[PDB]
Amino acid sequence: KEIPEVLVDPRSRRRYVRGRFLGKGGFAKCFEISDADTKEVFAGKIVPKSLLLKPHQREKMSMEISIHRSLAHQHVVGFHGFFEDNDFVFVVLELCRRRSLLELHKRRKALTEPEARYYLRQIVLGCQYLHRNRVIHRDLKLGNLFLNEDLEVKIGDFGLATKVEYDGERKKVLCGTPNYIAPEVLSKKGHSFEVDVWSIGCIMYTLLVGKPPFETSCLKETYLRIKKNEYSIPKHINPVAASLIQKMLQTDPTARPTINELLNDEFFTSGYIPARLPITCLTIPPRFSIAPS
Numbered sequence: 001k002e003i004p005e006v007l008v009d010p011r012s013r014r015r016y017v018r019g020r021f022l023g024k025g026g027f028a029k030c031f032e033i034s035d036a037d038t039k040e041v042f043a044g045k046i047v048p049k050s051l052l053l054k055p056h057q058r059e060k061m062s063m064e065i066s067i068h069r070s071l072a073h074q075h076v077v078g079f080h081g082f083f084e085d086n087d088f089v090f091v092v093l094e095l096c097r098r099r100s101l102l103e104l105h106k107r108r109k110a111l112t113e114p115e116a117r118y119y120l121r122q123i124v125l126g127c128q129y130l131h132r133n134r135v136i137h138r139d140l141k142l143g144n145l146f147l148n149e150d151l152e153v154k155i156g157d158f159g160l161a162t163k164v165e166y167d168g169e170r171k172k173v174l175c176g177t178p179n180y181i182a183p184e185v186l187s188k189k190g191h192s193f194e195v196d197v198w199s200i201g202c203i204m205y206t207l208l209v210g211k212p213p214f215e216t217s218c219l220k221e222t223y224l225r226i227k228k229n230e231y232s233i234p235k236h237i238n239p240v241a242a243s244l245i246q247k248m249l250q251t252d253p254t255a256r257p258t259i260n261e262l263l264n265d266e267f268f269t270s271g272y273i274p275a276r277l278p279i280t281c282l283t284i285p286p287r288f289s290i291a292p293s
């Protein structure tokens with residue numbers, strides 16, 4: 001059951017030449033795809049219906065599209081359309097040519113504090129937007145924070161995202177395995193937006209420390225630690241940073257900052273936030289000199 005060389009959308013009359021394989025995110029296989037008219041290049045997410053035999057699995061795809069199609073923001077992955085044939089579902093997404101913060105972290109490990117500020121601010125801005133529109137992402141991790149050509153963060157993968165339908169709603173269920181799973185999810189006693197503030201907490205730790213907050217050999221031993229709040233921040237981490245991590249990584253959901261509180265935190269306001277990063281920042285730690293030589 002092989003994927004077409006050209007992807008034709010009969011409704012919009014659009015044709016996409018299937019370009020080079022990018023990798024296999026989940027059930028989906030991802031390719032650079034180019035529109036035949038505009039020549040505009042996109043990221044195609046192609047999932048075979050043979051893996052969507054069950055309504056439950058079909059419904060998760062549908063919801064992902066439902067949620068992601070309704071979003072437009074600078075730090076959210078552009079959703080440009082979807083369509084299907086008898087064998088596949090095709091989703092046309094914003095190509096993010098510098099991959100994700102995961103690939104950056106693999107190369108650089110711990111970032112400089114300004115780099116963290118730069119990225120975390122964009123992670124927070126997109127996540128503020130989701131929350132404003134009642135969307136919880138629920139799997140914010142380095143692999144889901146994509147980078148465009150200018151190293152701007154674009155929040156992607158809405159396969160666990162859920163829409164809050166009514167004020168004060170606690171989601172009882174999360175069908176999936178998020179990377180930075182909040183303790184209220186692991187305890188299985190309800191959760192809302194504060195789940196995303198947890199993950200951002202873990203992302204900040206990881207960006208600054210160079211490894212995740214609760215990491216172990218065993219995945220269940222890690223879950224043990226998240227419940228128990230078993231983690232510690234190295235001494236070389238600056239107090240203002242370490243304070244904000246501690247605020248975000250509280251077992252109590254109600255005790256964490258809201259998404260609209262974060263950028264007013266001392267970490268952002270009393271520290272240097274680059275306007276932009278150079279592409280060398282993918283490879284080499286930037287020093288942020290005041291002038292060249």
Ligand SMILES: C=C[C@@]1(F)CN(C2CCCC2)c2nc(Nc3ccc(C(=O)NN4CCN(C)CC4)cc3OC)ncc2N(C)C1=O
Binds near residue numbers: 022044093097
């Ligand atoms: C459908 C898009 C996708 F679903 C998935 N991702 C990634 C996650 C893993 C699969 C693609 C996106 N990626 C990309 N771009 C790229 C991913 C991987 C490689 C790249 O260099 N790939 N290499 C990996 C090593 N291989 C041996 C060669 C290909 C190169 C990329 O851009 C040129 N843009 C957007 C997305 N988004 C937002 C999505 O939602």
Ligand SMILES: [Zn+2]
Binds near residue numbers: 056175176
């Ligand atoms: Zn399920």
